[PDB]
Design a protein around this ligand. Structure first.
Ligand SMILES: [Mg+2]
Ligand SMILES: [Mg+2]
Length: 194
């Protein structure tokens, strides 16, 4: 049921924090996981580069919404923030990552030019999960207590009987991971418009 075990064996309360207003010197980045039948997710991550601490500050998750509807639901916080997004092509062909990113850009999101990668061009999920777990354990990854869809997924994220990530209920998790991977594109809060 939880396979060979949960991926993040960390008490939720250790990574949960009270919401606060973003300081001018924090960096801000958004991320998107695409989805129609599956939920899509749009998240916002704050990065204190001085303390090197990450805050998952905003989360929106919803099935069967268009890009126009997503923008209407999150534009209050998503406006002008660069957006990381997945998909180097293949999902039984047709318009995957790049065509969907266009629909989202047209809807008003500041979509980043390229799909989410680490600095070296890689996109390993395993690598992202390891780095995120380290941050959690070191007290350097926090989630606002108002971002409940993160915790819902966090609780269920597990590996199958052979040790592979079971890729379900992981839209907010994926988005969070994309924002983290692309953190070099995060913009300083005071330079946004402030
Ligand atoms: Mg789909
Ligand atoms: Mg998904």
């Amino acid at each position: 049921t939880m396979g060979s075990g949960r991926i993040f064996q960390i008490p939720e309360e250790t990574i949960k924090c009270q919401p606060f207003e973003c300081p001018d010197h924090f960096y801000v980045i958004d991320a998107q996981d695409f989805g129609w039948n599956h939920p899509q997710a749009h998240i916002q991550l704050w990065w204190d580069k001085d303390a090197d601490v990450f805050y998952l500050a905003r989360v929106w998750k919803k099935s069967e919404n268009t890009a126009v509807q997503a923008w209407g639901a999150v534009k209050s916080w998503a406006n002008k923030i660069p957006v990381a997004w997945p998909h180097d092509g293949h999902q039984h062909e047709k318009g995957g990552g790049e065509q969907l990113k266009t629909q989202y850009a047209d809807a008003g999101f500041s979509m980043l030019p390229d799909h989410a990668t680490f600095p070296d061009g890689g996109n390993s999920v395993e690598s992202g999960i390891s780095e995120l777990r380290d941050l959690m354990l070191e007290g350097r990854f926090k989630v606002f207590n108002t971002c409940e869809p993160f915790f819902e997924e966090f609780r269920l994220y597990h590996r199958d009987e052979n040790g592979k990530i079971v890729k379900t209920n992981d839209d907010v998790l994926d988005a969070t991971r994309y924002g983290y991977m692309m953190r070099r594109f995060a913009r300083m809060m005071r330079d946004i418009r402030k």
